[PDB]
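Q: A reviewer asked whether we had any structural model of the full assembly, not just the individual parts. We don't, so I'm hoping you can provide one. Inputs are below.
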Amino acid sequence: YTVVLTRDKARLIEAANDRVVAEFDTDNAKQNNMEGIPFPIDNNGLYTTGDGGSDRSANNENSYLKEFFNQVDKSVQELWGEHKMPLVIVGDVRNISYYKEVCDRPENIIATVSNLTELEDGN
Amino acid sequence: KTMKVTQLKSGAHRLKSHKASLKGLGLRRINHSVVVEDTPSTRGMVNRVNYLVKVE
Amino acid sequence: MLQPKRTKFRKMHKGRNTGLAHRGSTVAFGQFGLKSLTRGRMTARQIEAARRTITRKIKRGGKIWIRVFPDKPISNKPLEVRMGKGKGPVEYWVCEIKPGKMLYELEGISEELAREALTLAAAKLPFKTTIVKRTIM
Amino acid sequence: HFALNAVDRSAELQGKGASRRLRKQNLVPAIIYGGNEEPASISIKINELVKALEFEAFFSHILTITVDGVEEQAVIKALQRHPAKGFPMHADFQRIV
Amino acid sequence: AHKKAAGSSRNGRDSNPKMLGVKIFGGQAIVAGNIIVRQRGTEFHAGAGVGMGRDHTLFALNDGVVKFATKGKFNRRYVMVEEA
RNA sequence: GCUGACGACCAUAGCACGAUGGCACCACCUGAUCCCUUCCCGAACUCAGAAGUGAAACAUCGUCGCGCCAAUGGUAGUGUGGUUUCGACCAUGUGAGAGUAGGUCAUCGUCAGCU
RNA sequence: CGCUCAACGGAUAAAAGGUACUCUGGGGAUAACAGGCUGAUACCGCCCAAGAGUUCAUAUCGACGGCGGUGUUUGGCACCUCGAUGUCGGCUCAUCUCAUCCUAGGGCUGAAGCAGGUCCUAAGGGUAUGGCUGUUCGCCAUUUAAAGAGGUACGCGAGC
RNA sequence: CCUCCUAAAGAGUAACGGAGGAGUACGAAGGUGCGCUCAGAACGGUCGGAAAUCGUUCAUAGAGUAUAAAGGCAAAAGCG
RNA sequence: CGAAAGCUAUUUAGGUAGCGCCUCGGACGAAUACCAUUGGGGGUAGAGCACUGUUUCGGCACCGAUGCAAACUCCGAAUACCGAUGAGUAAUAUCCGGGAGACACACGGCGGGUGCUAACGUCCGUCGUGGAGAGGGAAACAACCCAGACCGCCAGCUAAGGCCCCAAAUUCCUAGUUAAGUGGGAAACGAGGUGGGAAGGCAUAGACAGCUAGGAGGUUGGCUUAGAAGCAGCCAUCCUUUAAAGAAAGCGUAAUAGCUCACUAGUCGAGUCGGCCUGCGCGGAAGAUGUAACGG
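A: Here is a predicted structure for the entire assembly that you could use as a starting point for your response.
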């Protein structure tokens, strides 16, 4: 698995060796019966849209990122339970950090790449 | 014929018709006893508030 | 994952699960049944898990019947959403279970192994359960 | 195996509260109807009825209800048991002729 | 709003009440012109002594006592005004 | 005894199946000049009639195959007062639906006609 | 007879914005902080045991499902405060919890030994310094027996 | 503004509750008298079939009702 | 004497107006309320599949079994509501006019919508209480339970709740249960706690347990598999010496091997075994200033 993280979104790719198997978009079978947010997951936090009951002077942004990555890991674990493959975390160093601290099964992580470009638009 | 009806519990917080059944028997307070004719129409008033009153 | 086919209305009122299961309280299809002693909602995920357990234990040698079908759409509000602004979207389907209800029946297999298959299935269900045999009256 | 002892059930042990209060005395209400005369309301002991019901031929044979004296030839027609607890709650008997 | 769930489903309309139903019940005194039933369609049919308006309102054509009955081959509910 | 008209009632009155009826009555039936009909048609409506037949229809009679009606008992619910582990339970008053036993091939009124 | 006077009991025949340059009267009738209620979500724990573990469900891990505990994340509510309860971080100074990071005692082990892994007991002490960034955190360098998780108005501005 | 539900078997009854419609049409689609009965299925029949028109037999309405829905509709309120 | 925090409308939403609710005066006088008997219409709770849907199994959309539904109903209560008749009791009902206030309601039950059958949440309906209500109880505690304070009394009886001490009143009586301080927080689930109740199985033709001896031969059943030899898995459960011994219930081996078990015989000698239901208990059970989850 490739978990692509961003402050704004998360993507999930299934990859065999050096090719992409699937992208985990709206038209997939593995996301049909999901109890969590399906990929691609947008970070539609109340702080991201500017409502909800929080202020920027509270400095809760790191906590918000941690909880968003926790929800991302929930979706990742839900999908992984049906296939059980190792995952590679791609993203900024700080995002990878937050995700590693939040991951429910951090033993299945085999690699982390932080120098990959175009996390949100690249294919 | 007549019967004696006594009030045992307070009627202050009862349903409106139960209060009205007390007042239609003639009962006005706890431990008040009245004598009323023993007809089905009065016995229905006693039945309505049988938890509130006793018949001698 | 059982679910109704086309339905008449997307969303439903909560309702009240009250009373005993006077209907569906008899082993009517197989010889052997798992009956609910308590009331609740039988989610379609729970139905499927207890069906896969039973099937894996009976091993294509017997027959299983499911007497619960999830036909009640249950809505949920998403996180970070205030009260109001309409009724939430449908997320899953439950069956209303009352005490006495059959949930599964087994036929065509040893009583001991059918007992342990239903005992395995009861562990996936949010009900206190009893195991009953089919009677005449 | 096909003979059961019963007791009369009078009009004061009939009704919802009376039936509930009678089942709290380890008794099962039952009605014998059919033949060519009025139905008779009886009460059968719960343990006796449970033991009688254990026999699978009890449902398809001629039974003999002995109500402390007068005796009747009957066939069980209906048996409503508890939906969840499973114990018998009421029995129907049809008088054969 | 994390799972994209809450969204537009606009239905907050409803019409005003119409105050239908039986106005004068069986056995009551009635004077001519009094409305007995306000209804949609002939849920009740006018028997002897009662007429029907353009909106299927049943009203008394004469003084008397209102009677409800089921009669005819269609088992229709009928309201009558008997001269009592 | 039977037939016809108009009603009460609106399945315990219905359906299905079988039998009986032509002296009155009814129904088919004959014809289409005339009255009146057909977006064409004497099919229906209508008129003028009795050669034939109760075939169909209709009426009556028979039955339980279906329908329909339907207890008793129990159960569910429920008003009031109380309790409760909120499922319910207790006292009292009510009391289904479903199902079972069972019932049913209707019952009456006014008038006319044949016997 | 002439109204999408449709904000449809229709303010005028006739009408948009900005204010971080601002101001007044009010409100905890109503939001942002912190408390409270709640516990969906979260975190922790437990139940079942498909499977992985070369064999072997239960050394270790635990798919599909189920049940709790905590208040602890993200939330829900609007009960307290708008005739004022100062916000994040740092500094200083702490105090408590135990779901224990080290040190102590153990059972099991896929425990030869050395090292570990899990779980049980255990809160007496102890539990880095730096580079980056306002950061909390995080990454990194080098250590250490260890660099614990939290509560305390996310402790502490009438202490900085 | 209308229809259903919420609405707890008289009426009424709220929510940024769950579902739909209206802001018309028609001088006949109004009045009356008279007359008629639908949808579907099966069987037979030139083109012609799954389905056109024709004939037969079942068929309380499974149709229609200018339109949303509900309630009604055989004395049809449906169709000439 | 005594509300309201409702309805309708509103550039209205914390304002105001009409109506509702309060008061005063006048008119009228039983037209009002309660209950009994009785005349009504209903589509709710429940129930059901006849319609609209939805659902599972079998036979072949249809037949049969089997479920479910606010916007489904072949049905269908209780209450409630609208009438009639009648007794008793009652500081009634209605109308005209003077003066208002109120149009932020709250909680606890009941029936629902919403929410997560979350919220001291929100929105209706209905009852009670508070508001505007003191007194007693619930440790303390508007809204819960009992009960409505005109004033005075060093009189008595009771309600809810209580009676070992704080603290008024039983260390009261009868029959039991619990050993957990359960009582005096917490579930799935686990267990050989303990009491009770309906039945069963076996037994001096020696029952249960222990101990002693055996537990075998076709055969390593066939297949599959590197290997599958009772014991990975798939397909049968046969026969033989038998007092008995499974084509095996476990441990074990890579597979065999090996150790047990089921079962039988012997020893001993009397009751014993396992399910079902029920009462009360046990574990599951970790938090932050201090015992701190009976007020002590």
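A: Points you may want to mention in the reply: Chain C touches chain E at residues 76-81, 85-89, 91 (CB under 8 Å). The first strand of chain C starts at residue 32 and ends at 36.
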